[PDB]
Q: What sequence folds into this?
């Protein structure tokens, strides 16, 4: 009978704890203000943007493609004059895909190299993408029309992403860039309001259940007066807000974020150079990320926070660099360690508290954050499928008329197919790509895997608005759909209305195409170099020569083309 | 109840989402919704032992520039999927498994090769012996022809993955 | 070692429940709701407002069914003089015995009497209210009209009703009825305990069902006797009591047909199809879950009612000669005798208070925006005039604080009138049986409503009322509209007396055959004969001509 | 912990909301906002025993026709409040007591008489001895002159209500 007492008491304390918890969750959700937000958006120049989109593989090497010598490399001239051929390039695109040695990476590569080579003449590129896309459709072997463009089994698809990017850049910098940067900033700022685990990057505020910090943690916003040194005693005040649970580096990152947000110049290139001092007895003692007074759970040491140092509100805190007094006040950056995720921990390490780890009890936070940044999400979404001056971007309208006419060319009596093609070609293969890689559009954008997860969530939400089936979300459906389940149908309506509006807009003769594509081509002919492109495509031409030659011979090839082929070989050789 | 992280990799429209939903809700609906990122989870009794599974439903290989390496890094089990109606998707799995082994930096990784849509024998392109020989070629790897539509070997995938995680 | 399993099931159910709250909150689709709005005739309106106490008896003040009564005209002649009436109200107010209810009484009687001459009523109300205002020795200008310590206040409520009724039927009534119907419907969508009336869905933590009841929505095929048969579909819950199911069938009938199936619920019985034969189900039978001195009512789930089940209905003239059960709801002590859902965490269901709060929100916005809305870019006549009075008086008492203006406006108009209409919908609409729960919810909405008038930016915390947190995010938008609404009336054109006199006269003449002055003056006199020494001692001090005293004593000679 | 439903009653603007906020949120602000319906709650200890309070701040006795009956039946502890600035607020406490004892249908109803705003000694119109006389008049009931602006007798109110509910 003695155990009954302990059991009852336990369940009691646990219950009341859960009370305080859920209560705090509701109170929080209701009392969450929107103190988010910038000015000049750090846009990228078209060269860097396009290069990052075409080759997000070797990010730094992509500077090799940004621009006499052309006239010198006659091989490049021959190859170039050869690419301008429709039949040749057709065989060149099909024969490669025909071979099983030709992987996905090979396909992306080819598509982008071909885009850079054909970036001077975008007319021809448009027309060849049209034939390459119609051949992936009309004479497609594995063709279930509502499943087209989904599996990356062709070069044409990645090509289509490239072309969408090329043609829609203007529209991005004009009408979509601001809300996208505003959303990335919104999320970033929002997540920095609540605790983040320094070792798992899991945070309290988030849009992803996977990324959620379902850990019990008591925190409180600390206002910190920041002093900068420039000798021994030099001080200038600054207001920086942190948390009681923030690790040292996290604090450093916050004061640096703030500093840049007030002076437009990073106080330091590398964050490791700065050390942080604290005042307790009127004297400043440098605080380090981990000291001799740090608890150890088994074989792993715990990171020192601000509550670890008993830091209170209005605390004065000093900033030192490497040229001030770091001759002796230098600490070793913990995060630099190879196995830092095994040697250290912050807010996570693997009876009342045993049941306080319940994941669902934190799902409301996903709601809260979803509530916090919903204005920016809606802004971005509406600015993506909206039409300024009642007209649509040239490439969008044109390409949708192209799809419509294609469906007309194949005798298709199901509007669902047209819808599917429209949503598989543009938003999936383009808009999601900008949505999931905002660094393609902006500079000095460091993307975290967490923010990647949040953007993943918003992207999926964006994709469900292009669905055709009213999905019944129950207890079995993933949270990422649940969060945006209410806003989906409005978006769906706006989508169908959007495709309608695009369909009913006045058609476009190829005169406008002429002036436009010529304008873009003349705008970007000298930016990249077709030399490296063609030289890096030759590696592909000679590696599958017999198959291309065969595919071209089966389609009645003139002597001229083949003589030019062997000429290219002879020029590259001799 | 321990938590398992099973990741479903593959190309565009091979039935990753189909298999995951069929495993989760038991329902198959012939629809067309590109998965971008969907996180499922379910409690299931494996080998007379109730464990907590977590199925991550990824997107096609190259539908957009994506975060492939993250869920590979954290993932404990992998179910590579290919539609037997398209040889291309079956070819695309090689570099994927390669990336798995490279990131995990080992060879004893819980993994299964699944040839979905084995209910369309009249439309089959990839033979069973192809995928079987490929599984044999991948160090006696686990292989299954599945059909989320006809409820064929849908659960045995994730099951064998769990049984492999606890194995040596 | 027996705590691991208990806590296993415990945390399991917990997870399932919180997740289910999140899912329901995310999967909540709007499907609320009318046609014509059953408003009350101006008579019953005015009467149920003037005397909310005597419920039915108010119809005795309605002459919708005086020269002989020699005592009425004399006392009315007395009231006609401003001095006599002023000293009357004042002297009566200065009494310790004069209870709170007596003030509402005399106010309502006075308004009812002088309903025929709105000019004199308006004038004397202005004078008396200014008396309350500028000469108040024990009052703070910012706490004016707050403490019910004057006839002028209840009288002000009455006058507000009189003058704003037209606007009520104009643009505020319909959204109000819509909000009430939507609220009732919403609450009734989720399980309700028959004993406590605590439902899962609500807008009040007090009125919250804090128990995890696993139910399931069922489409029931209902059949009607006349033997005879007629198909219908009723959406009932598996946890519903037999009388709850009955209420849902009756509601569905009265909605989908336009006329009620009956007037009494006690005279109807429900039959269920077992295996061909129909067994009439009762509220409590033998095998009922009895726990001590309390017994569990029969739910649908108790009889294993499947989805799409067949249901028959029985009237007292059909086959209810011997086929009739007794009504448990009539039991003088039913709470103590039977139980339904109740006989353990509350905050876990605060989420529900959100769900409903969203489902019934558009209607709330309609009501609020209507109340402080301007039809054809024009504010109500009474509003502009009364606020003009407040402005002029504030300019007449040496005050330089716009806060006092706002506060007076928020203590005179929305508090005295709009809350009275918001919390009491049955003062507006006929046949609206008022439930306590709906009264609680309406108290929440009315509370938010008047919080939208506050001049104090109060940050909501953990120690704030759930009702405040439930509408706190939406408040500060309303505040800015309320603030701007007030200033528009200030910037509205001054009201010409040519429009004023006509506006008063039309209604005065259109309501001269509505109320009887007889009973009114007859009940009003009783306060004079009660405190005569006070009235005389005040009147004689206020320089009373021999006319007033002669007339008064003549009235006393005619009344006794 | 134990659940304790309490009700705060008084005329319009007698410091009910004031006392309540002063007791739960600790802070006081001279603000002019009419209360309609506010169900509070707070974890608080009495007689070395922690319990869970449940306050209901009510509205003016006649600012509008309201749910005057529900909380009298369901309430357990009652704090009646007048202001020492206006006399009528003291004159309006009788019918309150009346309806309480009538609806609850018993003479043993946990109640406390409070003359709030005891920080105004120049506008005082109601004596303390008057309130004490009314206190003894109600079968020797408790009487505590309080003030939400000075944290005087604030906690003692609710603590006494709980204590009276106990015994
Ligand atoms: N016959 C058959 N069809 C399937 C099966 N699984 C998926 N599908 C079809 O494949 C289409 C796309 O599948 P989906 O789940 O979206 O592919 P995902 O990209 O891997 O998520 C759907 O329309 C299904 O009809 C299967 O097991 N059998
Ligand atoms: N000096 C003083 N003023 C008070 C006290 N309590 C309330 N007040 C003031 O009285 C005014 C109205 O009181 P309030 O509590 O809002 O009235 P209620 O909501 O109807 O109970 C407020 O503006 C307060 O500033 C007190 O203890 N001392
Ligand atoms: Mg998918
Ligand atoms: Mg109050």
A:
């Amino acid at each position: 009978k003695q155990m009954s007492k302990k059991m009852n008491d336990q369940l009691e304390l646990m219950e009341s704890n859960i009370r305080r918890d859920i209560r705090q969750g509701f109170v929080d959700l209701q009392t969450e203000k929107s103190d988010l937000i910038v000015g000049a958006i750090p846009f990228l120049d078209y060269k860097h943007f396009a290069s990052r989109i075409f080759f997000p593989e070797a990010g730094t090497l992509t500077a090799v493609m940004i621009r006499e010598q052309t006239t010198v490399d006659e091989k490049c001239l021959a190859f170039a004059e050869l690419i301008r051929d429709k039949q040749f390039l057709s065989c060149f695109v099909h024969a490669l895909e025909e071979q099983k040695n030709f992987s996905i990476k090979d396909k992306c590569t080819v598509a982008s190299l071909l885009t850079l080579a054909l970036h001077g003449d975008l007319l021809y590129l448009t027309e060849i993408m049209e034939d390459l896309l119609q051949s992936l459709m009309d004479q497609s072997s594995n063709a279930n029309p509502k499943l087209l463009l989904r599996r990356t089994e062709s070069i044409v698809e990645k090509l289509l992403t490239n072309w969408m990017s090329i043609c829609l850049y203007g529209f991005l910098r004009e009408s979509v860039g601001q809300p996208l940067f505003l959303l990335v900033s919104a999320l970033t700022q929002q997540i920095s309001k609540g605790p983040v685990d320094s070792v798992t990057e899991k945070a309290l505020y988030t849009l992803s259940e996977d990324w959620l910090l379902c850990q019990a943690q008591d925190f409180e916003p600390l206002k910190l007066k920041v002093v900068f040194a420039v000798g021994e005693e030099i001080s200038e005040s600054l207001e920086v807000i942190a948390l009681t649970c923030d690790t040292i580096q996290q604090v450093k990152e916050k004061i640096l974020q703030t500093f840049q947000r007030k002076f437009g110049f990073r106080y330091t290139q590398q964050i490791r150079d700065i050390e942080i001092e604290y005042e307790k007895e009127g004297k400043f003692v440098m605080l380090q990320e981990v000291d001799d007074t740090s608890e150890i759970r088994g074989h792993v040491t715990m990171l020192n926070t601000l509550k670890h140092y008993q830091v209170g509100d209005g605390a004065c805190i000093k900033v030192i660099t490497p040229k001030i007094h770091a001759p002796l006040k230098t600490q070793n950056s913990v995060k630099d360690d190879k196995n830092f995720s095994i040697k250290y921990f912050h807010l996570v390490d693997p009876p009342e508290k045993k049941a306080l780890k319940i994941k669902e009890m934190y799902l409301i936070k996903l709601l809260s954050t979803k509530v916090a940044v919903h204005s920016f999400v809606e802004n971005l979404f509406k600015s993506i499928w909206g039409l300024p001056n009642n007209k649509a971007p040239l490439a969008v309208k044109y390409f949708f008329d192209f799809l419509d006419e294609q469906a007309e060319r194949k005798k298709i009596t199901d509007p669902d197919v047209l819808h599917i093609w429209k949503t598989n070609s543009l938003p999936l293969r383009f808009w999601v790509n900008i949505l999931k890689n905002p660094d393609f559009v902006f500079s000095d954008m460091e993307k975290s895997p967490h923010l990647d997860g949040c953007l993943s969530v918003i992207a999926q939400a964006f994709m469900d608005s292009f669905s055709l089936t009213d999905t019944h979300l129950d207890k079995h459906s993933p949270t990422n759909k649940l969060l945006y389940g209410k806003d989906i149908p409005q978006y769906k309506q706006e989508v169908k209305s959007y495709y309608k509006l695009v369909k009913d807009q006045t058609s476009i003769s190829s005169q406008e195409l002429k002036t436009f594509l010529q304008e873009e081509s003349k705008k970007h002919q000298n930016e990249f170099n077709e030399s490296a492109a063609l030289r890096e495509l030759y590696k592909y031409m000679q590696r599958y020569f017999t198959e291309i030659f065969q595919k071209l011979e089966q389609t009645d090839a003139p002597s001229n083309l083949k003589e030019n082929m062997h000429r290219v070989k002879e020029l590259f050789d001799n | 109840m321990r938590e398992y992280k099973l990741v479903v990799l593959g190309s565009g429209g091979v039935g990753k989402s189909a298999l995951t939903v069929q495993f989760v809700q038991g329902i198959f609906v012939e629809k067309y919704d590109p998965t971008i990122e969907d996180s499922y989870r379910k409690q299931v009794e494996v080998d007379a032992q109730q464990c907590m599974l977590e199925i991550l439903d990824t997107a096609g290989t190259e539908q957009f520039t994506a975060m492939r390496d993250l869920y590979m890094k954290n993932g404990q089990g992998f179910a590579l999927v290919y539609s037997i109606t398209a040889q291309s998707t079956f070819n695309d799995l090689q570099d994927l498994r390669e990336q798995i082994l490279r990131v995990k930096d080992t060879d004893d990784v819980p993994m299964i090769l699944v040839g979905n849509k084995c209910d369309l024998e009249d439309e089959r392109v990839v033979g069973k012996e192809q995928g079987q020989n490929l599984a044999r070629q991948w160090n006696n790897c686990a292989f299954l022809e599945s059909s989320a539509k006809s409820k064929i070997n849908v659960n045995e995938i994730f099951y064998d993955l769990v049984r492999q995680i606890n194995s040596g």
Remarks:
- Chain C has two domains: 1-214+344-560, 215-343.
- The first helix of chain C runs from residue 3 to 26.
- The CA atoms of residues 187 and 201 of chain C lie 5 Å apart.
- Chain C touches chain D through 54 residues (CB under 8 Å).
